[PDB]
């Protein structure tokens, strides 16, 4: 009867998840009609509607997308406050969303403005770090490095066999990379200082070491085809180098299995997962808790019906549908009885001296002509191409961060 418009980003977990979730919600609430749209370019799909005033009612699109639409709408104050959804009952169950959510998932990612208001409800619960061919390392006797000195020495040995040490799909995948690396060096509070634009945080030795370590990685041990493929159309080709054995490591999450399931691979390939190495021996290594976001535009016409469907996305019925391709909703018990192909990822949490890290940059203030994500993530391509020095990389980060601190 009543029509709801839902637009969901199609990623490594696939688009058939939302087709099956929408149909299940329409089975529970037959008076609700959901016009589902899935696309790998959500902004280009819904922009004609937003330009014509026909906004979607609910959008699944986490931060760090290629278009940056979620961050743009947060800057423009165009995303509805959905704090009340936490206290809403999940359709078909006798519990609230806040009761089912895992502890600590509400933070700077879900509350980008820094307060207790939730604007981006957490989607998925994927650990992020480095993925590799477990078989290739074992056949060459190469142990998984825990430090970057072991990492660079491994890159020297791999190049003698025609293998580059490092690659990445797009430069945006350094969000989880730096989240772990910054917490590896400076610690928990230091990472929060970076996300909250603490004064002169990028002039600290901890922040300089994270950039210098990433500098040597992308200027010497990078696959020569990485930058040329670091786009929305060719990012799977950089990931394909891992399956072909031409690259050893790349930063990614649990969606990589279903995303590359039909791709060719070296004989006996097996997915390996590990946290991002730290700098010091025996130091704590962090695993990034990568979540996406579901939200409601401020210009949506059917906000109440979208809130009830958003609460349904945390039901057990929707969780079982999402988990078929590796998408683990951030609800309790969802890491129990995990699929076999997810075990190699979540078992990394059981390693010694390994903690979790989560969050993104604070959207509490905006400065004209400055994006801190471009100066840290997107700048990796310029650094790898040789157009940006280590000092220039650090100076622009400090200038933009301190400018956001004063705003």
Ligand X SMILES: CC(=O)N[C@@H]1[C@@H](O[C@@H]2O[C@H](CO)[C@H](O)[C@H](O)[C@H]2O)[C@H](O)[C@@H](CO)O[C@@H]1O
176 binds, among Ca ion, Na ion, ligand X, none (CB under 5 to 8 A by kind): ligand X
Q: Does 288 bind Na ion (CB under 5 A)?
A: no
Nearest distance from C-beta of residue 112 to ligand X, angstroms: 15
Q: Does 254 bind Na ion (CB under 5 A)?
A: yes
Q: Residue 17 or residue 32: which is nearer to ligand X going by CB?
A: 17
Nearest distance from C-beta of residue 86 to ligand X, angstroms: 23
The number of C-alpha atoms within 13 Å of 82 and in the hemisphere containing its C-beta is 34
257 binds, among ligand X, Ca ion, Na ion, none (CB under 5 to 8 A by kind): Na ion
11 binds, among Ca ion, Na ion, ligand X, none (CB under 5 to 8 A by kind): ligand X
The CA-CA-CA angle for residues 19, 236, 213, to 5°, reads 120
Q: Does 205 bind Ca ion (CB under 5 A)?
A: yes
Place of tokens 């471009």: 374
Query: By the criterion CB under 6 A, which residues form the site for ligand X?
Result: 11-13, 64-66, 128, 169-170, 172-173, 175-176, 232, 235, 255, 259, 290
Q: Of 43, 44, 7, which is closest to residue 22 (Cα–Cα)? A: 7
Interruptions in the chain after residues (C–N over 2.5 Å): none
Quote the tokens at residue 324: 């078929």
Q: Residue 11 or residue 272: which is nearer to ligand X going by CB?
A: 11
Dihedral angle, C-alpha 62, 55, 373, 386, nearest 10 °? 100
Q: Does 128 bind Na ion (CB under 5 A)?
A: no
Q: Residue 200 or residue 205: which is nearer to Ca ion going by CB?
A: 205
- Tell me the pairing of strands 247-253 and 121-133: antiparallel
Q: Does 326 bind Na ion (CB under 5 A)?
A: yes
The CA-CA-CA angle for residues 49, 55, 56, to 5°, reads 110
Q: Of 201, 209, 210, 207, which is closest to residue 405 (Cα–Cα)? A: 201
The CA-CA-CA angle for residues 305, 306, 310, to 5°, reads 120
Q: Does 258 bind Na ion (CB under 5 A)?
A: yes
401 binds, among Na ion, Ca ion, ligand X, none (CB under 5 to 8 A by kind): none
Q: Residue 44 or residue 205: which is nearer to Ca ion going by CB?
A: 205
- Beta strand ranges found along 10-120 (DSSP E): 32-39, 58-60
Nearest distance from C-beta of residue 206 to Ca ion, angstroms: 6
Give the binding site for Na ion (CB under 5 A): 126, 254, 257-258, 326, 328, 341
């Amino acid at each position: 009867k009543t029509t709801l418009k839902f637009a969901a980003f199609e990623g490594g977990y696939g688009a058939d998840m939302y087709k099956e979730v929408v149909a299940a919600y329409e089975k529970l609430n037959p008076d609700v009609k959901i016009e589902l749209t899935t696309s790998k370019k959500i902004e280009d799909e819904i922009t004609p509607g937003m330009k014509a005033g026909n906004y979607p009612d609910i959008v699944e699109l986490g931060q760090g997308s290629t278009s940056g639409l979620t961050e743009t709408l947060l800057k423009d104050k165009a995303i509805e406050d959905v704090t009340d959804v936490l206290d809403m009952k999940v359709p078909g169950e006798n519990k609230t969303v806040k009761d089912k959510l895992v502890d600590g998932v509400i933070g700077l990612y879900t509350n980008p403005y820094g307060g207790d208001k939730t604007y981006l409800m957490p989607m998925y619960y994927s650990p992020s770090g480095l993925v590799y061919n477990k078989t290739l390392l074992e056949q060459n006797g190469w142990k998984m490095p825990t430090t970057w000195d072991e990492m660079f020495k491994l890159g020297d040995e791999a190049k003698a066999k025609g293998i580059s040490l490092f690659t990445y799909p797009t430069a945006g995948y350094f969000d989880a990379f730096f989240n772990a690396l910054l917490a590896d060096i400076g610690g928990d509070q230091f990472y929060q200082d970076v996300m909250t634009y603490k004064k002169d945080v990028w002039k600290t030795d901890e922040a300089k070491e994270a950039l210098e370590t990433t500098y040597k990685l992308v200027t010497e041990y990078l696959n020569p085809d990485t930058v040329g493929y670091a786009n929305a159309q060719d990012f799977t080709k950089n990931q394909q180098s891992i399956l072909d054995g031409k690259s050893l490591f790349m930063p990614n999450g649990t969606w990589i299995v279903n995303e590359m399931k039909d791709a060719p691979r070296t004989s006996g390939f097996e997915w390996g997962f590990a946290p991002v190495p730290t700098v010091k021996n025996g130091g704590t290594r962090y695993i990034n808790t990568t979540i996406e976001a579901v939200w409601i535009p401020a210009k949506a016409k059917n906000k109440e019906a979208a809130k009830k469907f958003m609460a349904y996305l945390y039901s057990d019925e929707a969780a079982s549908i999402f988990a078929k391709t590796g998408a683990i909703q951030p609800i309790k018990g969802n890491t129990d009885d995990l699929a076999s192909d997810m075990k190699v990822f979540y078992d990394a949490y059981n390693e010694d001296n390994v903690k979790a890290v989560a969050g993104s940059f604070s959207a509490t203030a905006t400065v004209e002509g400055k994006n801190i994500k471009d100066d840290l993530y997107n700048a990796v391509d310029s650094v790898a191409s040789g157009k940006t020095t280590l000092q220039q990389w650090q100076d622009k980060l400090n200038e933009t961060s301190n400018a956001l601190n004063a705003a």
